[PDB]
Design a protein around this ligand. Structure first.
Ligand SMILES: Nc1ncnc2c1ncn2[C@@H]1C[C@@H]2COP(=O)(O)O[C@H]3C[C@H](n4cnc5c(N)ncnc54)O[C@@H]3COP(=O)(O)O[C@H]2[C@H]1F
Lengths: 175, 175
């Protein structure tokens, strides 16, 4: 049961910090250049987390980075928190724009199954992925930092489109 | 037993990535400006991890940052990995220079004890801190990425000097 600590580390280390300042950083980018107002976190339950989001789906294109967020943390001066903005194509048309990224601990969970010393078996990846997604959902429900500033996209994979899955959450948000 | 996953997340997410390129980044800084050749990770077993290293000890002074390390990870373009270099004073004298930082998961472990939903009790901080330090030691022993490029400083706290503790590991390294 190591997915529980990873979910809390994901909140304590990442989301508790960037979410309060997130909507102010998006308004900064929009005024100089639109992008939706919340961060969309991808949660593939098969634990397949590609490093390059454009390879997962050609219709997901990188556009530009948000302004950086820096702070002194654990002895590191101005540790850099940056997020990438993606345009989601549909039938050759720009169907939306948002800040999109995977949940890094999912791949961190994936890599633990390879190492023998971790004691984490391959068969447990899906169960711990659901637990990570479920524990993260329970955290952000009571999290004061998250006031409708974050959206979690969880899915299981033989035809599938991540652009359509992301666009689904985008369209329903506009209502 | 959540400290086990945090140690592996610390290795998979951070040390597996920066250590292979670490010694090349130090040689870059030294040639333009010396600093020791390995990264010193602070592991206070009381789980007290200040954000500003200069507050922990006045004799630990920030000097300058290393060149950044960037890579595309989990959908984020050019995620920034940066480390701070510190000069350690002794009796008003510069007694050494090295890349120094705390282990971030230690504070991440510390914050989990506050939240009730985490199910992590305050009394377990010391035991999990030792387990995190011990599990991290077992990982870096078999880690091919770590070939004498990293040093772990673990300690327990009524007179104590972190500068003296760090300088102890520095002096013994030179032999
Ligand atoms: N660049 C860096 N400098 C210093 N230490 C770093 C580091 N990268 C990693 N580490 C160490 C390894 C450990 C687990 O690394 P991951 O497996 O990537 O899981 C991270 C992913 C997410 N996350 C946090 N910051 C960002 C960000 N800026 N961009 C995108 N995702 C982020 O939050 C999780 C918990 O973060 P943490 O700071 O509590 O623990 C980290 C820290 F101990």
């Amino acid at each position: 049961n190591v997915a529980h600590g990873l979910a809390w580390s994901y909140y304590i280390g990442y989301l508790r910090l960037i979410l309060p300042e997130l909507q102010a950083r998006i308004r900064t980018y929009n005024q100089h250049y639109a992008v939706s107002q919340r961060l969309y976190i991808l949660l593939p339950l098969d634990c397949g987390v590609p490093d390059n989001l454009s390879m997962a789906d050609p219709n997901i294109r990188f556009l530009d980075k948000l302004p950086q967020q820096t702070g002194d943390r654990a002895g590191i001066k101005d540790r850099v928190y940056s997020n990438s903005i993606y345009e989601l194509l549909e039938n050759g048309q720009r169907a939306g724009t948002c800040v999109l990224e995977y949940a890094t601990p999912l791949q961190t969970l994936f890599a633990m199954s390879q190492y023998s010393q971790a004691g984490f078996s391959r068969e447990d990846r899906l169960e711990q992925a659901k637990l990570f997604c479920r524990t993260l959902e329970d955290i952000l429900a009571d999290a004061p930092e998250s006031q409708n500033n974050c959206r979690l996209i969880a899915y299981q994979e033989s035809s599938f489109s991540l652009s359509q899955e992301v666009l689904r959450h985008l369209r329903q948000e506009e209502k």
